[PDB]
Design a protein around this ligand. Structure first.
Ligand SMILES: Nc1ccn([C@@H]2O[C@H](COP(=O)(O)OP(=O)(O)OP(=O)(O)O)[C@@H](O)[C@H]2O)c(=O)n1
Ligand SMILES: [Ca+2]
Length: 425
DNA sequence: ATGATGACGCT
DNA sequence: AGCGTCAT
């Protein structure tokens, strides 16, 4: 009772850019703004593969991974922007650079963990503490939270009026006098996230959504509840009702085989149903670490820290060669390894200038035709010089003998070069 | 014939 | 070391 930890020790946000690649292309090309549009990679095969979709185009059913020719069937007026292609492969440099624009703004407010090209977690616990002292005991005005939803409220007209009704019920109940109230801490966290999101939009033109809660899993779930261009506060108290109809696969790390096995072995559907099992029962089905994690998570409790990490730990370059394009001669394999190695050298050289580090290991991964796995084979070698001809030759040497005989058999459907094991320089 | 990319766990 | 899982 008095010794039951409630997982309310931190304020954590997750910031997620809305249709990110689309916003990057729309900033650059005003003719694309406020239109059904998508970002595509390649072009010759069925018009290219869709990677990102504006909310106007999503209303027609356009989705990621769809071929652009097929998307045009659902949305004949769909506008398209193409990803840059360099040395025969898609070149995402424009979007990584726009990502850095955003991450550098967020880093002004708190330590961030880069979660992907367009997501970062924020540990706001200290910023909230400082802000709670500056705001003496003053109440929090609804005007400081103009894009915030309070999940679960209102309880007991149009979209915006309902948002404000919920926000009013939340603020009216807040114990402003208690500087240790977790609900007050989340609310201040949301005020800071409003400021952070305003700064991102002012300084880059980009809109985003955010979740604010007590841990990373709840912040990530919260972020998706009201997209786009809104933020959502998930309090500890909101968790039982929210989890009572929340499919297990929606929780971060439960979207794959482990989540499917929770459903199958326990015969449940929703995250809240996990509360009925003991920690030992969950550890027996899913392992010590997974069971302890599940036991706490279904109660809204998670301790995974926001890691102080803005830079990737690996830098990689990959390309698929599907169907009849599979690489089937030694010259082909060697030419494409050179193309990937040239793009990788370019990124590594910029990384060494920008971030004062050198990679020391080169990982080479290939996929062989007829293998459903992401990678058929991984080998490593020393990365001593940032020279593309050397890296591609080393990569070849390391995979040479996977060839079961001028010809390459079986043909390669993927090539992957990854620079890893960075050291300060 | 979705991709390109990246983190981390298990052994 | 090398493979498997899960994610944007
Ligand atoms: N299966 C996926 C999902 C995402 N991504 C990468 O992650 C980026 C951002 O993904 P995501 O946040 O899922 O999509 P958005 O386009 O930003 O849409 P949303 O508004 O839903 O966040 C994409 O551009 C893409 O580069 C990817 O490569 N493969
Ligand atoms: Ca996004």
């Amino acid at each position: 009772g008095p010794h039951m930890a409630t997982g309310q020790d931190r304020v954590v946000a997750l910031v997620d850019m809305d249709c990110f690649f689309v916003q990057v292309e729309q900033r650059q090309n005003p003719h694309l703004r406020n239109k059904p549009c998508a970002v595509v990679q390649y072009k010759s095969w069925k018009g290219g593969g869709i990677i990102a979709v504006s909310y106007e185009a999503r209303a027609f059913g356009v989705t990621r991974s769809m071929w652009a020719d097929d998307a045009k069937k659902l949305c004949p007026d769909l506008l398209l922007a193409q990803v840059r292609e360099s040395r025969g492969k898609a070149n995402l440099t424009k979007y990584r650079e726009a990502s850095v624009e955003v991450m550098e703004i967020m880093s002004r407010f708190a330590v961030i963990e880069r979660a992907s090209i367009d997501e970062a977690y924020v540990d706001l616990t200290s910023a909230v503490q400082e802000r709670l002292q500056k705001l003496q005991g003053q109440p929090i005005s609804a005007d400081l939270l103009p894009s915030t939803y309070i999940e679960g409220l209102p309880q007991g007209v149009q979209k915006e009026g309902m948002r404000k009704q919920g926000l009013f019920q939340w603020l009216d109940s807040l114990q402003i006098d208690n500087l240790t109230s977790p609900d007050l801490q989340l609310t201040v966290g949301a005020v800071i996230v409003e400021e952070m999101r305003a700064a991102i939009e002012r300084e880059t033109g980009f809109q985003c959504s955010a979740g604010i809660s007590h841990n990373k899993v709840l912040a990530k779930l919260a972020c998706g509840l009201n997209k786009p261009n809104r933020q959502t506060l998930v309090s500890h108290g909101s968790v039982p009702q929210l989890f009572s109809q929340m499919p297990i696969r929606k929780i971060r790390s439960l979207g794959g085989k482990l989540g499917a096995s929770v459903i199958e072995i326990l015969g449940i559907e929703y995250m809240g149903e996990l509360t009925q099992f003991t920690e030992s029962q969950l550890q027996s089905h899913f392992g010590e670490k997974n069971g302890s994690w599940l036991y706490a998570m279904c109660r809204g409790i998670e301790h995974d820290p926001v890691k102080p990490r803005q830079l990737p730990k690996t830098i990689g370059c990959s390309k698929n060669f599907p169907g009849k394009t599979a690489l089937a001669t030694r010259e082909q394999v060697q030419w494409w390894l050179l193309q990937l190695a040239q793009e990788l050298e370019e990124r590594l050289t910029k990384d060494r200038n920008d971030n004062d580090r050198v990679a020391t290991q080169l990982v080479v991964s290939i996929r062989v035709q007829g293998d459903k796995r992401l990678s058929s084979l991984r080998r490593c070698c020393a990365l001593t010089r940032y020279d593309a001809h050397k890296m591609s030759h080393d990569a070849f040497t390391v995979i040479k003998n996977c060839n079961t005989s001028t010809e390459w058999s079986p043909p390669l459907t993927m090539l992957f070069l990854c620079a890893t094991k960075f050291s300060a320089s």
